[PDB]
């Protein structure tokens with residue numbers, strides 16, 4: 001399966017995916033990395049790994065649909081089968097999500113359905129949970145509501161901040177995102193006809 005990874009920043013999840021997809025038994029290959037922000041560290045990681053990169057600045061498009069179409073164009077150029085959102089911080093449009101239905105994955109740093117949105121760690125700390133975690137899910141139109149593929153729980157320590165908690169949760173992200181990608185790319189897991197998760 002041919003994979004596009006979309007990023008907006010550091011790219012530690014991208015790096016974990018690059019490392020996993022180069023194992024001999026990987027069913028996935030990363031053929032393109034797309035960023036919506038220029039000069040981010042994830043681009044360096046991709047170029048260092050010999051993967052093509054494209055920057056699509058959302059600020060240069062009139063609306064969300066035009067932006068997504070620019071993304072889609074590149075996806076078609078590279079004959080992509082699967083899309084991974086890896087620190088990609090934009091909300092995708094309905095038709096774009098519909099086209100890639102069952103083919104697009106997102107990592108989210110909470111145990112969904114808790115703490116949806118862009119500041120999951122702040123929410124978790126504010127709420128005072130002692131267990132948080134991360135979630136890989138299929139991307140549906142409603143944000144952070146698509147079908148869950150894998151999750152891993154991560155403890156919150158007394159005195160945690162966003163810095164220390166996100167560091168601990170990233171260690172789990174780097175385990176389940178590659179595992180989830182391998183499940184979908186091998187055809188082991190798919191979005192079922194009834195929309196629910198199917199383990200073949």
Ligand SMILES: Nc1nc(=O)c2cc(CCCc3ccc(C(=O)N[C@@H](CCC(=O)O)C(=O)O)s3)[nH]c2[nH]1
Nearest residue numbers: 088089090091092106117118139140141142143144
């Ligand atoms: N249709 C859709 N379903 C999803 O399940 C999903 C996950 C993402 C991946 C990210 C989900 C995000 C949640 C909140 C964000 C935010 O508040 N701010 C962005 C600005 C860009 C934007 O919201 O369009 C920021 O960091 O500046 S970004 N994008 C998705 N789009």
Ligand SMILES: NCC(=O)N[C@@H]1O[C@H](COP(=O)([O-])[O-])[C@@H](O)[C@H]1O
Nearest residue numbers: 009010011012013086087107108109
């Ligand atoms: N709404 C999605 C979201 O919050 N994504 C989160 O952004 C970070 C990106 O780090 P990275 O650039 O090192 O992968 C990760 O913690 C990821 O779960």
